[PDB]
RNA sequence: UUAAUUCCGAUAACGAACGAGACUCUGGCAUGCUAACUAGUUACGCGACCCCGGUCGGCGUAACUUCUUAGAGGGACAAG
RNA sequence: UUCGAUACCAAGAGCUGGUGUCUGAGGGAUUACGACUCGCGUGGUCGGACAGCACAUGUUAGUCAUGUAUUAUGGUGUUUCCCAACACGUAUCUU
């Protein structure tokens, strides 16, 4: 069979995650490990939320690798949950009926917009006369 | 007799600027909108929706202004405000060739009868000839329009290799394509022109602007045939493919005329009034008949394509 | 070069090189209307250009001071012989060069011309040379022991924003008098020339212009001037 | 033949015109060009106090100095590219032609 | 806190005063005609002027706009 | 009314200049563009291990620029 | 149920697009030449048009300029490098 691959990325902060969608059976893996062995375990459902919204039937035809770098733990989990969701939508826009892509996009964007659109917030730079961005040092009189 | 709506084509974010039909397929129309996507539809004419969008053709940076389908029925050519063209195979909707050369927005683009000559009129004061193998063939810069080149059009009559180009400088220029040299200037229009077309005969040409005066033009002699009173701004102009009709988008309505005896065949204006509470009605910016001339497809500026079928 | 230092240290090395060169040449060519320096290190040439107003005084009698200055350049900074070549040239429309005008005022005060007459003489020459707006402020003790600040200003002068970095030319100098020191600040706003010779080629960011609509006349009846 | 022309400059549009000029010269002399690879810009940053004394509010000056690095690799005998790179020099950029 | 300054309003009023023939109700059409007719050195100020032109001319159509 | 002597209104004032703004750097966007052995990726051939696949920052060379890099334009305007 | 349009193929064409000969109409650089400066070497500034040319040398016009080899204030041939037909020229070869 020919190529049916789309490399699609998800950023929430410094962190970035490039999901490599491809034709095949249903497997999802992050840096070799599967989804249900990516700690912290507290945010287990954050990785599963695209699966439990769309079912495992939509991921029957696609085997999505994810490579991740940068940021911290919670940013990386929000990067990858976004990446695989965009990666499937980009697959269904290229190789499948756009009616299917439209249905999936409407299902996700109604549950949570953060799945397809990146969070544009970045850690603000520090200014002098203060220990942080806006905080200032304690002023003394007398 | 009269035309009437069956339904609407709802599958755009930015509003539709151009519609393109091919003679090969009846169940395949191509709509270019003021997002960066060309929507290739599948017409079913079912009770639910007249057509569902089966392909969206991505690759453009800025608004896709123009789109036109080739003779074969495989290739489409689109022109955008980014100042480049795109050549799409309708099969997978991946771009084959991109044409680069212009500086400002490319406002329209047209094929030959052969699909071996492409022409682009732009916001930068030029027309340019294009091969189908990504080559800057010929510029025309000095003897051109003194304002933007609003539109350019090729003719079905293949015996006279001519092109008609309507500009913003209150002209219609006509160039001998093999020479690419001026044949006839056409002064007469008061103000800028939106649209120019060539009647399927290859006989008489139309011209529409803000003035609301649809002036006919001759391709045989350099003579003004006659004029119609549009009333409102004409944004779109095209003839019926089988019948001897001319259809114009007079802003928020369609006015279709019989050409021998100048009287209104009918006027088509949305009767489901949504903009009834201090809102200006959204206005039709492109229209084109089917290959048969049974159905007129008209694209609006509220992200909608409407269908107009002959009740007689 | 086997010493092979970082591009970071290389550029701060070149930075201090020009900085001292300029200091030395401003100290030397002070009285003889000195405008500034420039370096063009070509393949195995250090073409070291000087800009002045009175270039005949600085290049001297049959090139005495030029070879003297080329000698101390090669001797101090540690250069190869043949490679280092000094070139003194005259700066165009000196009226606009804040360095030249500030040092001109300084040496009229060193001669002993009246202070309002010195400042208005300078400020008048700056404006007739074609400065869009001028500013001359000399501070320090006049007529007594309490320190005064005389300000002489005319035309349009901008203070804030980015355009200051390529429209306003500023220079500050010290003048030695018998009772104490006086400070000279010359501040010149250049005019707009599209050539970029006399001033800059960017128009002012807020300044917006409209080309006048060409007086046409609408046609009434349709025409054609057909040809072949 | 595999020769490495790198251009290190503090000003950007100067460096860009030199990068353009060497591509122009290369494509005219009919030799294979590797396009202008843009190494990351180094921002030399020094932040001092403003006041010479210490009898004010604590305000600091943030001095920056960007330094940009491009390189084009060519497949050409030394001579023709040496004579291409001996013309059209400005004071901003600095040249290095590396053979091996 | 979106109050346009004298430079926006004056230059927009002068462009409406002269070139009423080409300007319209669409933002991006008159942005391009404004860029063509007027030499505005920055792009932000171009968008600000074009934005005001297609607000005044959306009210000229209504009634007796003063300035 | 606005962050603002910021504006539109009334108005013997009209037209302007400095400061505010505009400006420069910066942050977020481009599956569009120019490029990459001092950046990668995808496919591949090989090699190692588990029971055809799976893992590899184990080894190596034809495509391409999604991720990294830094240039040119675009984009946002209280515009609907 | 007659008459002229419409899918088809062929009989060569013409068209059109691709390939590419040749010339420079042109377009560049500095190295001709000029100018402006001098430390007398250059350094800037024109950058091919703005220098020169020898009665050499193409075309000839006011027949009158002239005091009839003459020179008009012919005003364009000669030629030192480079890229070049979007100058859509067109050789060949295709479509």
UniProtKB/Swiss-Prot annotation, chain B:
Entry note about domains: The 7 WD repeats mediate protein-protein interactions with binding partners.
Subcellular location: Cell membrane; Cytoplasm; Cytoplasm, Perinuclear region; Nucleus
In-chain residues carrying the UniProt-annotated modification Phosphothreonine: 4, 8, 94, 275
InterPro entries assigned: G-protein_beta_WD-40_rep, RACK1-like, WD40/YVTN_repeat-like_dom_sf, WD40_repeat_CS, WD40_repeat_dom_sf, WD40_rpt
Free-text description of this protein's post-translational modifications in UniProt: Phosphorylated on Tyr-226 and/or Tyr-244 by SRC. This is required for binding to SRC.
Protein name: Small ribosomal subunit protein RACK1
A GO BP entry: apoptotic process
Membrane topology reported for the UniProt record: Peripheral membrane protein
Pfam families reported for this sequence: WD40 (PF00400)
Coiled-coil ranges per UniProt: none
WD repeat extents: 11-42, 59-89, 101-131, 144-176, 188-218, 229-258, 279-309
PTM sites of type Phosphotyrosine: 50, 226
Function: Scaffolding protein involved in the recruitment, assembly and/or regulation of a variety of signaling molecules. Interacts with a wide variety of proteins and plays a role in many cellular processes. Component of the 40S ribosomal subunit involved in translational repression. Involved in the initiation of the ribosome quality control (RQC), a pathway that takes place when a ribosome has stalled during translation, by promoting ubiquitination of a subset of 40S ribosomal subunits. Binds to and stabilizes activated protein kinase C (PKC), increasing PKC-mediated phosphorylation.
Taxonomy, superkingdom: Eukaryota
Phosphoserine: residues bearing it: 274, 276-277
Family statement: Belongs to the WD repeat G protein beta family. Ribosomal protein RACK1 subfamily.
GO molecular function, one term: translation regulator activity
Record-listed N6-acetyllysine modification sites: 128, 181
Gene expressing this chain: RACK1
Curated annotation (Swiss-Prot), chain C:
UniProt modification remark: Methylation by PRMT1 is required for import into the nucleolus and for ribosome assembly.
Modified residues (N6-succinyllysine): 132
Listed GO biological process terms: apoptotic process; cell division; DNA repair; positive regulation of apoptotic signaling pathway; regulation of translation; translation
Cell membrane is among the record's keywords: no
Class in the EC hierarchy, top level: lyase
Residues of the KH type-2 domain: 21-92
UniProt entry tagged with the keyword Protease: no
Membrane topology: Peripheral membrane protein
Modified residues (N6-acetyllysine): 62
Covalent link location (Glycyl lysine isopeptide (Lys-Gly) (interchain with G-Cter in SUMO2)): 214
Catalytic activity: 2'-deoxyribonucleotide-(2'-deoxyribose 5'-phosphate)-2'-deoxyribonucleotide-DNA = a 3'-end 2'-deoxyribonucleotide-(2,3-dehydro-2,3-deoxyribose 5'-phosphate)-DNA + a 5'-end 5'-phospho-2'-deoxyribonucleoside-DNA + H(+)
Subunit structure: Component of the 40S small ribosomal subunit. Identified in a IGF2BP1-dependent mRNP granule complex containing untranslated mRNAs. Interacts with HNRPD. Interacts with PRMT1; the interaction methylates RPS3. Interacts with SUMO1; the interaction sumoylates RPS3. Interacts with UBC9. Interacts with CDK1; the interaction phosphorylates RPS3. Interacts with PRKCD; the interaction phosphorylates RPS3. Interacts with PKB/AKT; the interaction phosphorylates RPS3.
Stated family: Belongs to the universal ribosomal protein uS3 family.
Full protein name: Small ribosomal subunit protein uS3
Organism: Oryctolagus cuniculus (Rabbit)
UniProtKB/Swiss-Prot annotation, chain D:
Single biological process term from Gene Ontology: translation
Post-translational modifications reported in the UniProt record: Polyubiquitinated by ZNF598 via 'Lys-63'-linked ubiquitin chains when a ribosome has stalled, initiating the ribosome quality control (RQC) pathway to degrade the potentially detrimental aberrant nascent polypeptide. Deubiquitinated by OTUD3 and USP21, antagonizing ZNF598 activity.
GO molecular function, one term: structural constituent of ribosome
Modified residues (N6-acetyllysine): 17, 58
Gene Ontology CC annotations of this record: cytosolic ribosome; small ribosomal subunit
Annotated S-S bridges: none
Residues with the Phosphoserine modification: 76
Chief location category: cytoplasm
Top-level lineage group: Eukaryota
TM regions (residue ranges): none
The entry's keywords: Acetylation, Cytoplasm, Isopeptide bond, Phosphoprotein, Ribonucleoprotein, Ribosomal protein, Ubl conjugation
Localization per record: Cytoplasm
Family stated for the protein in its record: Belongs to the universal ribosomal protein uS10 family.
Quaternary structure and partners: Component of the 40S small ribosomal subunit.
Its biological purpose: Component of the small ribosomal subunit. The ribosome is a large ribonucleoprotein complex responsible for the synthesis of proteins in the cell.
Identification of the protein by name: Small ribosomal subunit protein uS10
Organism: Oryctolagus cuniculus (Rabbit)
Lineage, top ranks: Eukaryota, Metazoa, Chordata, Craniata, Vertebrata
Full protein: residues contained: 18 to 117 of 119
From Swiss-Prot, chain E:
Stretch of the intact protein here: 2 to 68 of 135
Protein name: Small ribosomal subunit protein eS17
Compartment list: Cytoplasm; Nucleus, Nucleolus
Family to which the UniProt record says this protein belongs: Belongs to the eukaryotic ribosomal protein eS17 family.
Natural source organism: Oryctolagus cuniculus (Rabbit)
PTM sites of type N6-succinyllysine: 18
Function as written in the Swiss-Prot or TrEMBL entry: Component of the small ribosomal subunit. The ribosome is a large ribonucleoprotein complex responsible for the synthesis of proteins in the cell. Part of the small subunit (SSU) processome, first precursor of the small eukaryotic ribosomal subunit. During the assembly of the SSU processome in the nucleolus, many ribosome biogenesis factors, an RNA chaperone and ribosomal proteins associate with the nascent pre-rRNA and work in concert to generate RNA folding, modifications, rearrangements and cleavage as well as targeted degradation of pre-ribosomal RNA by the RNA exosome.
Subunit and partners: Component of the small ribosomal subunit. Part of the small subunit (SSU) processome, composed of more than 70 proteins and the RNA chaperone small nucleolar RNA (snoRNA) U3.
């Amino acid at each position: 069979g020919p190529l049916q691959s789309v490399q699609v990325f998800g950023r929430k902060k410094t962190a970035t995650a490039v999901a490599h969608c491809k034709r095949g059976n249903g497997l999802i893996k992050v840096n070799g490990r599967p989804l249900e062995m990516i700690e912290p375990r507290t945010l287990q459902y954050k990785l599963l939320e695209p699966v439990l919204l769309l079912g495992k039937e939509r991921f029957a035809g696609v085997d999505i690798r994810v490579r991740v770098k940068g940021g911290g733990h919670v940013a990386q989990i929000y990067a990858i949950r976004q990446s695989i969701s965009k990666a499937l939508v980009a697959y269904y826009q290229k190789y499948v009926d756009e009616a299917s892509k439209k249905e999936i996009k409407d299902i996700l964007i109604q549950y949570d917009r953060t799945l397809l659109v990146a969070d544009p917030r970045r850690c603000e730079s520090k200014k002098f006369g203060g220990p942080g961005a806006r905080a200032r040092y304690q002023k003394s009189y007398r | 007799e009269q035309m009437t709506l069956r339904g609407t084509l709802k599958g755009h974010n930015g509003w539709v600027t151009q519609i393109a039909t091919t003679p090969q397929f009846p169940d395949m129309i191509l709509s270019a909108s003021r997002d960066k996507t060309i929507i290739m539809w599948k017409l079913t004419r079912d009770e639910t929706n007249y057509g569902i969008p089966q392909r969206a053709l991505r690759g453009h940076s800025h608004f896709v202004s123009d789109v036109v389908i080739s003779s074969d029925g495989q290739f489409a050519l689109s022109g955008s405000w980014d100042g480049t063209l795109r050549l799409w195979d309708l099969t997978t909707g991946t771009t084959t060739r991109r044409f680069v050369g212009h500086t400002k927005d490319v406002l329209s683009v047209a094929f030959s009868s052969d699909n071996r000559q492409i022409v682009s009129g732009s916001r930068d004061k030029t027309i340019k000839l294009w091969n189908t193998l990504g080559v800057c063939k010929y510029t025309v810069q000095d003897e051109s329009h003194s304002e933007w080149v609003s539109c350019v059009r090729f003719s079905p009559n293949s015996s006279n290799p001519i092109i008609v180009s309507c500009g913003w400088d209150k002209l219609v220029k006509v160039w001998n394509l093999a020479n690419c040299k001026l044949k006839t200037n056409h002064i007469g229009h008061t103000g800028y022109l939106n649209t120019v077309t060539v009647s399927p005969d290859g006989s008489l040409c139309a011209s529409g602007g803000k003035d609301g005066q649809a002036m006919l033009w001759d391709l045989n002699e350099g003579k003004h045939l006659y004029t119609l009173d549009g009333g409102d701004i004409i944004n779109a102009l095209c003839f019926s493919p089988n019948r001897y009709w001319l259809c114009a988008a007079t802003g928020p309505s369609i006015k279709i005329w019989d050409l021998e005896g100048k009287i209104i065949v009918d006027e088509l204006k949305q009767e489901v009034i949504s903009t009834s509470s201090k809102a200006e009605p959204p206005q039709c910016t492109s229209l084109a008949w089917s290959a048969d001339g049974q159905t007129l497809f008209a694209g609006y500026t509220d992200n909608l394509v409407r269908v107009w079928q002959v009740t007689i | 070069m086997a010493v092979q230092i970082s591009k970071k240290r290389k550029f701060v090395a070149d930075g201090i090189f020009k900085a001292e060169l300029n200091e030395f040449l401003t100290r030397e060519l002070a009285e003889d209307g000195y405008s500034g320096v420039e370096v063009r290190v070509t393949p195995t040439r250090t073409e070291i250009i000087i800009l002045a107003t009175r270039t005949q005084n600085v290049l001297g009698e049959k090139g005495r001071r030029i070879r003297e200055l080329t000698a101390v350049v090669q001797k101090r900074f540690g250069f190869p012989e043949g490679s280092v070549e000094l070139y003194a040239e005259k700066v165009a429309t000196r009226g606009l060069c804040a360095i030249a005008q500030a040092e001109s005022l300084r040496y009229k005060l060193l001669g002993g011309l009246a202070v309002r007459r010195a400042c208005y003489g300078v400020l008048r020459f700056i404006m007739e040379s074609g400065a869009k707006g001028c500013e001359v402020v000399v501070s320090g003790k006049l007529r007594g022991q309490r320190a005064k600040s005389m300000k002489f200003v005319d035309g349009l002068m901008i203070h804030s924003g980015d355009p200051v970095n390529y429209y306003v030319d500023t220079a500050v100098r010290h003048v030695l008098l018998r009772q104490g020191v006086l400070g000279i600040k010359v501040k010149i706003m250049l005019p707009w020339d599209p050539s970029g010779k006399i001033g800059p080629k960017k128009p002012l960011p807020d300044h917006v212009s409209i080309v006048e609509p060409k007086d046409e006349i609408l046609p009434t009846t349709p025409i054609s001037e057909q040809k072949g | 033949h595999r020769i490495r022309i790198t251009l290190t400059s503090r000003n950007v549009k100067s460096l860009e015109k030199v990068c353009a000029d060497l591509i122009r010269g290369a494509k005219e002399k009919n030799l294979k060009v590797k396009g202008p690879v843009r190494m990351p810009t180094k921002t030399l940053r020094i932040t001092t106090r403003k006041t010479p004394c210490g009898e004010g509010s604590k305000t600091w000056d943030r001095f920056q100095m960007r330094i940009h690095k491009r390189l084009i690799d060519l497949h050409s005998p030394s001579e023709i590219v040496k004579q291409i790179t001996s013309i059209s020099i400005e004071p901003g950029v600095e040249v290095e032609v590396t053979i091996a | 806190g979106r109050v346009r300054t004298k430079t926006v309003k004056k230059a927009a009023r002068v462009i409406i005063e002269k070139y009423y023939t080409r300007l319209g109700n669409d933002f991006h059409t008159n942005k391009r005609v404004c860029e063509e007719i007027a030499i505005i050195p920055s792009k932000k100020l171009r968008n600000k002027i074009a934005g005001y032109v297609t607000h005044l001319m959306k009210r000229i159509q209504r009634g007796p706009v003063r300035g």
